Short mmCIF file of C-alpha atoms and ligand atoms in Angstrom, two decimals:
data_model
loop_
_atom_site.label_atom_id
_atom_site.label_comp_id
_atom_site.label_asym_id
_atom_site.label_seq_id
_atom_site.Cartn_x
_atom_site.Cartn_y
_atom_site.Cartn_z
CA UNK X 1 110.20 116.55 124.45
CA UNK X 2 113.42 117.56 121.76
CA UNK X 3 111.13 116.62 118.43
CA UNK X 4 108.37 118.75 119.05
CA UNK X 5 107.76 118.90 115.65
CA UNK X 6 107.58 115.38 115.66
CA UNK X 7 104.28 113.85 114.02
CA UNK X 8 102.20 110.86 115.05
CA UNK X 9 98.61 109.82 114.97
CA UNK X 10 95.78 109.52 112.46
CA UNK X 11 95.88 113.70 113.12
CA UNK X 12 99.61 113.98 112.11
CA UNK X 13 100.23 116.29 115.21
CA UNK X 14 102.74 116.37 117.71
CA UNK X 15 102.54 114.31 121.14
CA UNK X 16 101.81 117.55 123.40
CA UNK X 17 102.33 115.39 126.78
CA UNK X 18 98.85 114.01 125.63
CA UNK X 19 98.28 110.33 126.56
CA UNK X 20 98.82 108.11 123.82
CA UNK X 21 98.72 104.03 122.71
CA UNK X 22 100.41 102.44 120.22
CA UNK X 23 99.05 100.07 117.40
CA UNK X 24 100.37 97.08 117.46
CA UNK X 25 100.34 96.65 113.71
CA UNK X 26 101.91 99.76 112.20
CA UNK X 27 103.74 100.79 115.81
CA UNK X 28 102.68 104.18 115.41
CA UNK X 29 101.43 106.21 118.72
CA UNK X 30 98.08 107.64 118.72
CA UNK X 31 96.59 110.08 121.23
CA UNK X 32 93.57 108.35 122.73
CA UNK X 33 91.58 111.20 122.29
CA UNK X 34 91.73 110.74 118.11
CA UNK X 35 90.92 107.22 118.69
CA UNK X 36 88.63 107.16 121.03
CA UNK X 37 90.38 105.69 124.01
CA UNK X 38 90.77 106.87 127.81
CA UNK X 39 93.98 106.24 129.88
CA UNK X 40 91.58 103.97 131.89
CA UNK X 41 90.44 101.87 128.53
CA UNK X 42 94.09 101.56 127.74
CA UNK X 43 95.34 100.68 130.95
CA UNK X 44 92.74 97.61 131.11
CA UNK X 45 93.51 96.86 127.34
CA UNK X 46 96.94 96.65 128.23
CA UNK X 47 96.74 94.75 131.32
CA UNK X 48 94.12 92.25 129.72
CA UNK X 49 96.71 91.92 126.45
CA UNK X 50 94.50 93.20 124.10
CA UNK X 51 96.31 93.65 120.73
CA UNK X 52 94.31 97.36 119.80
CA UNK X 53 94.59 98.30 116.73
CA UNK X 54 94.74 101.84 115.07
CA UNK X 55 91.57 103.40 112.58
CA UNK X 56 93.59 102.03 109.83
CA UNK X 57 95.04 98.78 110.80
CA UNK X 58 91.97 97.73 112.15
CA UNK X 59 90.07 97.11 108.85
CA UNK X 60 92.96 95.07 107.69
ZN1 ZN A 101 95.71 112.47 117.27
ZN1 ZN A 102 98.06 100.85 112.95
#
């Protein structure tokens, strides 16, 4: 993309055409790797409306 320098994540790194989700607390994007999440799991989570939250928002 034009921001590769452009941060996200719990691992501040850039996206890296990596598959990512986004919390639905903060709004932040997070690769599913980092948070433990397959394209598959989101996909369901997604389709199911399952409001996933990040590492952080989670505990709140
Ligand atoms: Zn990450
Ligand atoms: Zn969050």
């Amino acid at each position: 993309g034009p921001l590769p320098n452009k941060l996200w994540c719990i691992c501040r790194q850039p996206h890296n055409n990596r598959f990512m989700i986004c919390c639905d607390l903060c709004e932040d994007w997070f690769h599913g790797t980092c948070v433990g999440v397959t394209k598959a799991m989101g996909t369901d989570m997604e389709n199911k409306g399952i409001d996933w939250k990040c590492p952080k928002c989670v505990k709140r």
